[PDB]
Design an enzyme around this catalytic site. Structure first.
Site, PDB file in Angstrom:
ATOM      1  N   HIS C 104     -20.781  15.145  14.436  1.00  0.00           N
ATOM      2  CA  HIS C 104     -22.260  15.389  14.915  1.00  0.00           C
ATOM      3  C   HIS C 104     -22.979  14.291  15.632  1.00  0.00           C
ATOM      4  O   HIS C 104     -24.147  14.096  15.896  1.00  0.00           O
ATOM      5  CB  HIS C 104     -23.241  15.694  13.901  1.00  0.00           C
ATOM      6  CG  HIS C 104     -22.667  17.171  12.813  1.00  0.00           C
ATOM      7  ND1 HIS C 104     -22.022  16.705  11.775  1.00  0.00           N
ATOM      8  CD2 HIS C 104     -22.637  18.347  13.212  1.00  0.00           C
ATOM      9  CE1 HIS C 104     -21.463  17.674  11.315  1.00  0.00           C
ATOM     10  NE2 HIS C 104     -22.003  18.776  12.033  1.00  0.00           N
ATOM     11  N   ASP C 205       9.341 -12.570 -10.601  1.00  0.00           N
ATOM     12  CA  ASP C 205      10.487 -12.197 -10.793  1.00  0.00           C
ATOM     13  C   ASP C 205      11.508 -13.056  -9.799  1.00  0.00           C
ATOM     14  O   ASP C 205      12.121 -12.485  -8.708  1.00  0.00           O
ATOM     15  CB  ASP C 205      10.810 -10.894 -10.438  1.00  0.00           C
ATOM     16  CG  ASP C 205      12.159 -10.169 -10.805  1.00  0.00           C
ATOM     17  OD1 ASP C 205      13.024 -11.061 -10.869  1.00  0.00           O
ATOM     18  OD2 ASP C 205      12.106  -8.992 -11.010  1.00  0.00           O
ATOM     19  N   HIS C 208      15.792 -11.719 -10.563  1.00  0.00           N
ATOM     20  CA  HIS C 208      16.664 -10.760  -9.517  1.00  0.00           C
ATOM     21  C   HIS C 208      16.991 -11.012  -8.432  1.00  0.00           C
ATOM     22  O   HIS C 208      18.132 -10.772  -7.804  1.00  0.00           O
ATOM     23  CB  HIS C 208      15.527  -9.621  -9.234  1.00  0.00           C
ATOM     24  CG  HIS C 208      14.759  -9.826  -8.123  1.00  0.00           C
ATOM     25  ND1 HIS C 208      13.816 -10.712  -7.914  1.00  0.00           N
ATOM     26  CD2 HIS C 208      14.977  -9.116  -6.797  1.00  0.00           C
ATOM     27  CE1 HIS C 208      13.027 -10.599  -6.804  1.00  0.00           C
ATOM     28  NE2 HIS C 208      13.731  -9.849  -6.146  1.00  0.00           N
ATOM     29  N   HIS C 213      19.533  -9.549  -4.248  1.00  0.00           N
ATOM     30  CA  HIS C 213      19.523 -10.096  -2.602  1.00  0.00           C
ATOM     31  C   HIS C 213      20.721 -10.711  -2.472  1.00  0.00           C
ATOM     32  O   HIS C 213      20.760 -11.826  -1.384  1.00  0.00           O
ATOM     33  CB  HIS C 213      18.367 -10.870  -2.598  1.00  0.00           C
ATOM     34  CG  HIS C 213      16.952 -10.318  -2.618  1.00  0.00           C
ATOM     35  ND1 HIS C 213      16.588  -9.298  -1.717  1.00  0.00           N
ATOM     36  CD2 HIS C 213      15.989 -10.314  -3.407  1.00  0.00           C
ATOM     37  CE1 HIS C 213      15.290  -8.835  -2.021  1.00  0.00           C
ATOM     38  NE2 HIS C 213      15.008  -9.637  -2.950  1.00  0.00           N
ATOM     39  N   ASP C 362      15.506  -4.455  -2.278  1.00  0.00           N
ATOM     40  CA  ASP C 362      14.539  -4.125  -3.336  1.00  0.00           C
ATOM     41  C   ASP C 362      14.357  -2.554  -3.560  1.00  0.00           C
ATOM     42  O   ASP C 362      13.708  -2.369  -4.503  1.00  0.00           O
ATOM     43  CB  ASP C 362      13.450  -4.762  -3.245  1.00  0.00           C
ATOM     44  CG  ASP C 362      13.347  -6.210  -3.443  1.00  0.00           C
ATOM     45  OD1 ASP C 362      13.950  -6.808  -4.544  1.00  0.00           O
ATOM     46  OD2 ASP C 362      13.101  -7.022  -2.459  1.00  0.00           O
TER      47      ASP C 362
HETATM   48  C1  LIG Z   1      10.046 -12.605  -6.101  1.00  0.00           C
HETATM   49  C2  LIG Z   1      10.151 -11.955  -4.850  1.00  0.00           C
HETATM   50  C3  LIG Z   1      10.793 -12.573  -3.687  1.00  0.00           C
HETATM   51  C4  LIG Z   1      11.272 -13.613  -3.992  1.00  0.00           C
HETATM   52  C5  LIG Z   1      12.035 -14.189  -2.626  1.00  0.00           C
HETATM   53  C6  LIG Z   1      12.668 -15.552  -2.936  1.00  0.00           C
HETATM   54  C7  LIG Z   1      13.210 -15.999  -1.693  1.00  0.00           C
HETATM   55  C8  LIG Z   1      13.793 -17.293  -1.947  1.00  0.00           C
HETATM   56  C9  LIG Z   1      13.451 -17.849  -3.091  1.00  0.00           C
HETATM   57  C10 LIG Z   1      12.851 -17.659  -3.985  1.00  0.00           C
HETATM   58  C11 LIG Z   1      12.309 -16.364  -4.085  1.00  0.00           C
HETATM   59  C12 LIG Z   1      11.637 -15.704  -5.180  1.00  0.00           C
HETATM   60  C13 LIG Z   1      11.292 -14.499  -5.071  1.00  0.00           C
HETATM   61  C14 LIG Z   1      10.542 -13.811  -6.159  1.00  0.00           C
HETATM   62  S1  FES Z   2     -22.329  13.154  12.096  1.00  0.00           S
HETATM   63 FE1  FES Z   2     -21.902  14.864  10.898  1.00  0.00          FE
HETATM   64  S2  FES Z   2     -20.290  14.396   9.656  1.00  0.00           S
HETATM   65 FE2  FES Z   2     -20.784  12.595  10.925  1.00  0.00          FE
HETATM   66 FE   LIG Z   3      13.325  -8.776  -4.033  1.00  0.00          FE
END
Ligand SMILES: c1ccc2cc3ccccc3cc2c1
Ligand code: FES
Ligand SMILES: [Fe+3]
Ligand SMILES: c1ccc2cc3ccccc3cc2c1
Ligand SMILES: c1ccc2cc3ccccc3cc2c1
Ligand code: FES
Ligand code: FES
Ligand SMILES: [Fe+3]
Ligand SMILES: [Fe+3]
EC number: 1.14.12.12
Lengths: 192, 446, 446, 446, 192, 192
Positions: C104, C205, C208, C213, C362
């Site tokens: 509107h 983390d 992992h 990786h 991941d």
């Molecule tokens: C969590 C998620 C990604 C990550 C990526 C990394 C890449 C290189 C070195 C350490 C890392 C630690 C990580 C920890």
């Molecule tokens: S002007 Fe009516 S819903 Fe936005």
């Molecule tokens: Fe990862």
């Protein structure tokens, strides 16, 4: 095809098969392939004025129907079998093109993205009108908008194209019987 | 949520909690208190004119079979087999004396009765009480000038009484014109909106037309094309708004007989409507004959809408809180020439059907307004419908109902939502009536 | 479920019920107790530097408009019209003095105020109180060295206080480096994981990395490539872990300034970081200058994560318990040469963006761990985060926070989940504080 | 809903509320009271014959690893890592001594034990109690002639006792034939039906065959082809129906050893079955030898079904109230020639597999009957299963169980649903037993 | 195309139309069709080393962008309009290929299944560089994995191919402007 | 291809690549394109008898498999790797065609709608049998029914076609390894 034996085949579909099984003219299939790839390119980049100017004949009928679901054995109920999602003359297409191009068409900002895939091209000259080219093709049309909206359309197109101004072949009829009865794409506001 | 106590709609219908467009528990509650209670559009005489003709229709999320009986009446039944619950009919329309289930072959008549069971004698002997195994029948089925409505609740008002003050406005086109026909089959499309979003828009929303449909107004050059982009406000006394006890309401835009239709139909329509109006002056009086050829944007509560003169007829079939299956038919005057009927039908679909360029203008508005109702910071926010509040009247000498004597306002939203809230907080029709005994006083405060 | 009583996270953060990654009722509860309560990342100065520049952002499941004001401040508002609730802005970024609703035509300023209403005089007269109809404003918006965060809860701690002991670790890169810029636009991809799965992985983390990786480490030949396939454990004193009162935490891997970046960037980065470190020794001291050029894997509670030096910046935008929309930006040091900024940005997306070969590693881990939280026999099972428990310290003379003086452990998971549980079981900030008055003692037991 | 009190299945199993096929809260309740309580099909010896062979299987919505141990026993474990809950195994079958998690590299033995943790000494020291961190083990795993079933509930009856009176009917084919093999891998397809819809159809539904499968009967020219289109009712004494205390049941169609198989297999099968029957007369007696070569349509409660002689073996794996993942194996007699085994397996898939033309006949029946259970006007409606009620017997001198001495009836539905209702309203096996102490008397009333 | 009249068309898109509307060389379209079908076959069977060796030029730029959603009427906001999902040289592609082939790429077990559909092929020689072939094509890429994961990608590709070692035509540039802003396919870790 | 280097490529897939990389016969690709477009047209209009008569050889094997998910590194487990969704001779196809055409096939009322998209056609004559034509193509098959049911299938087809009665080329083998292990299309009751 004998549609008394092939019980699932409509008279219309049997007629259209016959058209392509008869003369195969490899060059014509190639011309049709070009015409349709160029049309789809113009549409995909949203060059709607260019599409009208270069691809659409002044006498066009652009028609997409939706057929009511009826019993395969139905023989008595006789009322309007289909409605027209599109049934446009050139002027009606132009109205739609102006609507797309209007700077207050809020739904076109941010700009939509279209990608068309044209396959299964067949081409045959009309038997009685030597200047009328019948072209059949199928389209997958992908429309993406607003980050996470994605709509994919699927259709077979029965076209007639004829040479017009400058000897350019233009669309004079497109007929699509849309295969999905209840659309799950928000609208059918795309040029199939 | 406690629906007895929760204020979902504020006093006088002035606002509504945004969650009403998003809350799935409320949607389930609406199935009971809105859709199972009220009158819902099924079909038209013109789609099932002969004995044995049938269509399928939704009533809320339920599906029904709607069948012309041998005696000319219409009965409607759940599309669900009485044995193990398979869907009986899988087509949208046809003609048959009965329906046979594809699971175990039980055969039901057009009248819902269980007529045959395969090998009954060998299997059931005399022990199957077929008399008690007819299809579950829709309790109430009534006609308003050929338009067939159904209601699951035996206690509902007659359909005529349910239309309340809206009926007076519809009668010139629905009755005095010689009658309307519904042109099928409908377009069918799913939108990601709550059913209430298009329902409220058609009931009461002239304000959006100039801005939302800017592009369509300008491109089509229809009669109301001067509104495009809010370039011009409709003049003084260009129309009115009304609403009624049971929720139905409409806008009236004087003289707009060609409606949404692009310039290629305007002259023919304006001629046709004016000619009939001239005959109707003598029969129903000048004001009502003028109403006949004026554009009415109406919602028949809860989920049936229309634009008279444009010839648009809509059902907003509910699926879930953010999903609606939109059915679009055209309505035409029976005595129009057949070629005009055909062109008018195409034009309805052209403008508001599945590829309707006007209706596409509305998609994002309805869908996002509905989906925002799920968003945490918006659930408890207030949707506003206060435009024109304190200028509405009731019991006017010429125009019945609660009436805003201006073309653009939110009168009809207020009456729609007052009715909605009274149903949502009530367990039956008696309680709705008790909750509605001062309905017009509530709407006309200040 | 009774969130006051239900033990979702055990004492000292040692374990969590697997259902926390799957339960939709809990997800709805998080909308209130996590996302509506805490600080959420919106944008950077570098993306809206000039008056009128705006971006859209998610805050939980809500969408906001974030706008640079004429006075240089930033204000954020719900992206929802105050009339009937339509989404106001449909683009991701731009420059404007205001936002007009397509339904509107209501016009709101960059400052959220309702500035214009079409035909106000003719329609509303003087009765529309526009002063009360401004966009719903995000109560708190603060900056951490150009990084803009928002909070819906007026009672929240200042952002600086909320970062707690994490701030000390971030400041060398965020402040003393001369400042960072966020390079947009972000990549955006939907994963079928709970937002907590990537949040916990980035917070804490390092365990992992070598196994998950393996393939990316070996293929890219980045600096930490010796970890591939658990071929080598990082050496003694290779890094540390920390966590904080309000849930934010990180790993520190000493000296890893080139991070995930493949060998084609390592020499240039290691040169650039070492050169700045040499200047920073004099300004902030050796330890902090070393932290500047050490790889920090950090989550700013609840759902914003980053890898400094790698230059990865993530938002884990919640959709439902098993759906998350991942936004990926690159962060660069302002004083890097522009060509290096460009290559670093590409490399971030190459490694962890929508086609990031590292981040693909991941996907299955996050998605299946989240989806298993819905499975009947797993809902009541315990996710373990006990690695390093009983070796954490608090109040260390050099490294602040609750700290595990080892590169690989689950210290930061414990602090993340302690904070999570304190919020989930509390109705407001006062109750969170009461529940957190012995936070570090709880984390350092045994 | 209060499952202690709610009558979902009426006395004697005569009817069921249609909502049982649609209600998601009930589905969640079934996870506890049906799937976590009862015996569920896992695999066959023939699919994991050698030490270290494993398959994955669903048990309800949970996924398990099913592994052949070194001592020849089989143990089954949740496919979920004991650390942070990632799915351990991503393939359907293989051979391994253990399973390593792709997240942090924890290594579990084929026996479920936590065998290795990367860098355990450096990270956990001696503090990780690996003895307590084995995979969550399926409490009960038993075999019925090579067919391996699992049960999460330690209190369940032995599998043999659980099969009750059904076991007597299965033994000729499962035991006295020399044994069956399961031919894998299964076809897998998702249908939009409740698991109970195909379960009830296979347990008890000979009535549908002539009408539902009219087209398949006529097209394939299988032995039961005379039923096509209800052209002919099976003769007097053509078969029987049975049911049992714990819900399992079946139809028996005398002599139909070639089953669904098209005419290209009928002569060979009818020869093979007759030849074995002649040998079995001497060993198990004429009646049981006849049962061996008679077509049994059976459901092993809750969700495992089969057609003996046709050689069809099905698992209806539940996903939600209107979603089921259908697994289709072939069963063959071990001593059949290998070329016949191969052709029989193909024919099973041809008829009832993913492109099974017979099973396609059933899709709409199952899917719509299930989805209608969600529809408002149908939730409280009664699905009927009264055919043959008052003609069932118990304790017959020849045929054990509750037995309808007719080929077509609903005896097995009643016993299936009696068992279902007793579980749904009970908290444990003791309560099911108390609720089932007069099971056969309930089924044979009138 | 006149982009002042066709208001929805970008200057870039108008330039690319002109390239194909001008010389149609039927044989070139056929060569392009072959090159692209063979490339897609190598990719579909996960012969990634073969793809690099036979299809990819040493000087390649392999680029897929994602463009931020901005107002159709936006004229002031000027910052980075897009990010690079891919922007790879040959060595960067090789890194990605090694990652696919690594036996500790856990996500590739069980083996993925790819099926590509290439349509709308157009080919034109560069005007100024007689050895540079412009090829445009659209792809639907279907990836299935892990029983019930199915991801479908849709894109138009603007390629340049040039003859290299052995006279084999190889890809020297691929540009894709990905049509979906928010990916709903888990990742875009596929070679479009 | 060297499958010791291209570690993800199966021996079977490497064999099939070699077949098409070797002789390119542009005319044969065109004949194959026609054969497959006409086949897909007959199937799309549900002319199943016509399809058998005109497209399918008396000695056909029509096979679609589903392969169990196994570890990429799996080397010991040796049991049946796949099941046959289809493995039909001509008579078995005829049974299926009669089932489609039967007036008591309740699932075919209202009539289904099929749309097929055939792409990536490659054709090569067999080396040892000069009358055997190898054709490879990919299909997207869209099936719509009952208002809102939509199922889309994706596959690569390895065909052999041979001249039969009247010199008409007919299908003598179709092999499809279906890429999705768990079907999410209700059934696979379509002729790919
Ligand atoms: C969590 C998620 C990604 C990550 C990526 C990394 C890449 C290189 C070195 C350490 C890392 C630690 C990580 C920890
Ligand atoms: S002007 Fe009516 S819903 Fe936005
Ligand atoms: Fe990862
Ligand atoms: C609501 C919905 C649609 C409308 C459409 C209109 C078209 C022309 C003139 C007035 C209108 C009012 C409308 C009100
Ligand atoms: C239930 C489900 C399938 C059945 C299939 C049958 C095939 C041949 C003969 C009897 C059958 C009974 C059946 C009962
Ligand atoms: S479900 Fe209809 S006859 Fe059985
Ligand atoms: S989740 Fe399995 S080792 Fe960590
Ligand atoms: Fe509108
Ligand atoms: Fe059946």
């Amino acid at each position: 095809i004998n549609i008394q034996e092939d019980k699932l085949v409509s008279a219309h579909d049997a007629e259209e098969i016959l058209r392509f099984f008869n003369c195969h003219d490899s060059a014509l299939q190639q011309e049709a392939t070009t015409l349709l790839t160029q049309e789809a390119h113009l549409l995909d980049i949203q060059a709607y004025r260019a599409w009208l100017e270069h691809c659409v004949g002044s006498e066009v009928q652009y028609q997409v129907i939706s057929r009511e679901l009826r019993a395969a054995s139905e023989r008595r109920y006789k009322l309007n079998e289909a409605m027209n999602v599109y049934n446009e003359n050139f002027q009606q297409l132009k109205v739609r093109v102006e609507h797309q191009l209007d700077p207050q068409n809020w739904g076109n900002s941010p700009k939509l993205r279209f990608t068309r895939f044209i396959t299964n091209v067949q081409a045959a000259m009309d038997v009685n009108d030597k200047e009328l080219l019948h072209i059949r093709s199928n389209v997958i049309l992908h429309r993406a908008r607003r980050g996470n909206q994605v709509d994919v359309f699927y259709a077979a197109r029965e076209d007639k194209w004829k040479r017009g101004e400058g000897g350019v072949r233009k669309l004079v009829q497109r007929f699509v019987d849309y295969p999905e009865r209840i659309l799950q794409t928000h609208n059918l506001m795309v040029f199939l | 949520m406690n629906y007895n106590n929760k204020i979902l709609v504020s006093e006088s219908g002035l606002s509504q909690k945004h969650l009403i467009h998003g809350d799935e528990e409320l949607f389930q509650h609406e199935l009971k208190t809105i859709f199972a209670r009220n009158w819902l559009f099924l079909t038209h005489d013109s789609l099932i004119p002969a004995p044995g003709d049938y269509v399928t229709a939704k009533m809320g999320i339920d599906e029904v079979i709607v069948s012309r009986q041998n005696d000319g009446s219409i009965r409607a039944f759940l599309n669900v087999c009485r044995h193990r619950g398979k869907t009986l009919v899988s087509v949208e329309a046809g003609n048959a004396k009965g329906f046979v289930c594809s699971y175990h072959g039980w055969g039901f008549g057009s009248n819902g009765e269980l007529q045959s069971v395969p090998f009954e004698k060998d299997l059931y002997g005399e022990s199957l009480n077929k008399k008690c195994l007819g299809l579950k029948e829709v309790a109430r089925v009534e006609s308003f000038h050929g338009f067939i409505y159904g209601c699951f609740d035996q206690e509902a008002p007659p359909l005529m009484d349910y239309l309340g003050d809206a009926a007076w406005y519809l009668e010139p086109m629905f009755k005095h014109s010689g009658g309307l026909e519904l042109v099928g089959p409908p377009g069918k499309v799913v939108i990601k909106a709550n059913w209430k979003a298009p329902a409220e828009n058609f009931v009461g929303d002239a304000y959006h037309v100039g801005w939302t449909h800017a592009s369509s107004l300008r491109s089509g050059e229809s009669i109301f094309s001067s509104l495009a982009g809010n370039a011009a406000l409709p003049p003084e006394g260009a129309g009115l708004q009304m609403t009624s006890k049971y929720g139905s309401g409409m806008g009236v835009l004087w003289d707009g007989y060609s409606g949404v239709h692009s310039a290629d139909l305007v002259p023919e329509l304006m001629a046709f409507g004016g000619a009939k109006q001239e005959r109707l002056n003598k029969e129903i009086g000048d004001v009502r004959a003028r109403i006949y050829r004026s554009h009415l944007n109406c919602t028949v509560f809860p989920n049936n809408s229309m634009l008279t003169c444009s010839g648009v007829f809509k059902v907003w079939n509910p699926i879930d809180a953010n999903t609606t299956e939109v059915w679009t038919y055209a309505i035409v005057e029976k005595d129009m020439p057949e070629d005009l009927k055909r062109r008018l039908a195409d034009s309805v679909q052209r403008t508001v059907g599945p590829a309707g360029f006007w209706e596409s203008d509305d998609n994002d508005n309805m869908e996002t307004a509905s989906q925002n109702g799920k968003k945490y910071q918006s659930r408890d926010s207030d949707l506003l419908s206060n435009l024109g509040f304190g200028e509405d009247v009731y019991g006017d000498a010429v125009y019945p109902g609660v009436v805003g004597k201006s073309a653009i306002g939110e009168t009809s939203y207020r009456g729609f939502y007052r009715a909605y809230q009274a149903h949502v907080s009530s367990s039956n029709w008696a309680e709705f009536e008790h909750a509605s005994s001062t309905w017009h006083t509530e709407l006309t405060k200040t």
